[PDB]
């Protein structure tokens, strides 16, 4: 079961949520693999990977090396596949390397058939790049990460997202009147909304600074318990594959 | 002068600050034009533009129309130029339209040389597309919008900032250990920091719902006065036309 997590908008918390969902799924006793499809290569930092460690699947392919040799093991049941540190030229010229890396989509089809992992989470960036659409077509199910604000409200009315994808609220605050009005309206208007949300928790801001998933950094944190609920919801509702 | 605003990542608050700084400059009596270079086309919505209104400078160029006829007048001294509503096919296929928007560079430098506008603000997105690199090159000065978190702290090291840019802090919560630690590290490591910052304020979240700039929504709000201080700082430091 390959699950794709993508933000409706940048900076809503996709990287921290995928790392936490991975930890929560392996804690439930599932074999998980996590891949980082964002050029920012931030997912590796939630697993105590040295910032100077430039290896990754996208960096291995663009350097001619094998992508399978860029893996890192976190626990007996959690495997990590970083994106790789890009050059300054590659950051400023995304078009040159944008379409040289469709081999990973074929390589993920092997893993999906390998049976080694029950879950393969994909940290998807907020763009319409080709590799992102190719990877999104492999996922059996999809999550869309939002924040309760006017930016996401507008994006939910003008931006299309994958069919069957569900909406996961993150960074839900307490006390904001405009958030209460948007949220109360969402509960009656948004039909793709998930039955659980993720509150704003200082643990979510600290865990990245501590280079640990939020379920490992502070297991009794409210966000850690809400993401753990999400992990069980994935086991209940996102277990079946797409044809 | 021509002042560009670009977030270090998404969701940092570039659009809301760009609208608020434009309103603050027109309140100071300066002829200002503000243009939206993000394909999201979210800057128009801070000026009571009806959401169905699809017209915009990019919408005009792709349809073979005059982009100058896509302008809108908000006040006597504040004009705006939206990006335009892309269809679902167009936004999911950015390769189709990215290289077909270079005409805005010549028109921007003509508008620049005209002398009608004393400030031209450009809301730049996070992508490294050819158009956004071109518009960034035509700017006189630039602001890099950040939020004090571990995400922006990583990017500030692995992401090249434009030359001579200045970093602006938004969404500043008081009462967070990790944020205060990242801040105190920035105070002695970031020489490009500004002498002011924009606190997290409910007005900045409500104004977009009200489809107004924050200065017009609540002139008494702390964030509104902080951005007004930014406008006065721009008058004192960014008015030159560096060639």
């Amino acid at each position: 079961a390959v699950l794709g997590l993508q933000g409706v908008r940048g900076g809503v918390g996709t990287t921290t949520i995928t790392a936490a969902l991975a930890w929560s799924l392996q804690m439930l006793g599932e074999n998980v693999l996590v891949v980082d499809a964002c050029p920012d290569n931030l997912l590796r930092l939630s697993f105590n990977v040295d910032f100077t460690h430039r290896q990754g699947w996208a960096r291995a392919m663009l350097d001619g090396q094998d992508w399978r040799d860029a893996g890192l093991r976190y626990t007996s049941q959690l495997d990590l596949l970083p994106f790789g540190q890009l050059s300054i030229e590659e950051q400023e010229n995304p078009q040159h390397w944008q379409t040289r890396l469709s081999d990973i989509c074929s390589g993920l089809q092997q893993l999906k058939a390998s049976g080694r992992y029950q879950w393969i989470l994909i940290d998807l960036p907020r763009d319409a790049s080709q590799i992102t659409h190719q990877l999104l077509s492999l996922c059996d199910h999809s999550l869309a990460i939002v924040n309760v604000d006017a930016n996401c409200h507008i994006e939910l009315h003008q931006q299309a997202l994958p069919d069957g994808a569900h909406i996961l609220i993150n960074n839900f605050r307490i006390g904001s009147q405009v958030q209460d009005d948007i949220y109360q309206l969402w509960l009656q208007s948004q039909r793709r909304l998930l039955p659980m949300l993720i509150h704003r928790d200082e643990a979510m801001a600290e865990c990245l600074a501590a280079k640990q998933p939020v379920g490992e950094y502070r297991s009794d944190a409210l966000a850690a318990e809400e993401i753990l609920t999400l992990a069980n919801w994935c086991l209940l509702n996102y277990s079946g594959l797409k044809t | 002068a021509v002042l560009g605003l670009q977030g270090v990542r998404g969701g940092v608050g570039t659009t809301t600050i760009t609208a608020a700084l434009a309103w603050s400059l027109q309140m100071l009596g300066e002829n200002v034009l503000v243009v939206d270079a993000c394909p999201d086309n979210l800057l128009r919505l801070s000026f009571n533009v009806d959401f169905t209104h699809r017209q915009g400078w990019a919408r005009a160029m792709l349809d073979g129309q005059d982009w100058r006829d896509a302008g809108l007048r908000y006040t006597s001294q504040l004009d705006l130029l939206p990006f335009g509503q892309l269809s679902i096919e167009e936004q999911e296929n950015p390769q189709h339209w990215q290289t077909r928007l270079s005409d805005i560079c010549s028109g921007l430098q003509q508008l620049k040389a005209s002398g009608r506008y004393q400030w031209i603000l450009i809301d730049l997105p996070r992508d490294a597309s050819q158009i956004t690199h071109q518009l960034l090159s035509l700017c006189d000065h630039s602001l890099a919008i950040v939020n004090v978190d571990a995400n922006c702290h990583i990017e500030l090291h692995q992401q090249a900032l434009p030359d001579g840019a200045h970093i602006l802090i938004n969404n500043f919560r008081i009462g967070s250990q990790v944020q205060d630690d990242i801040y105190q590290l920035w105070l002695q490591s970031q020489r490009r920091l500004l002498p002011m910052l924009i606190h997290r304020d409910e007005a900045m979240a409500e104004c977009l719902a009200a489809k107004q700039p924050v200065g017009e929504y609540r002139s008494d709000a702390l964030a509104a006065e902080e951005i007004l201080t930014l406008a006065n700082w721009c008058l004192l430091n960014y008015s030159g036309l560096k060639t």
Binding site: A150, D181, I182 | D50, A210, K211
Partner: peptide, 22 residues
């Protein structure tokens, strides 16, 4: 009173009404 609260929220925020009154 939940029907009342939604009505006031649309009146308070034009952006919400703009999408709900289409």
């Amino acid at each position: 009173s939940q029907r009342e609260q939604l009505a006031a929220a649309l009146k308070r925020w034009p952006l919400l009404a703009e999408f709900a009154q289409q």
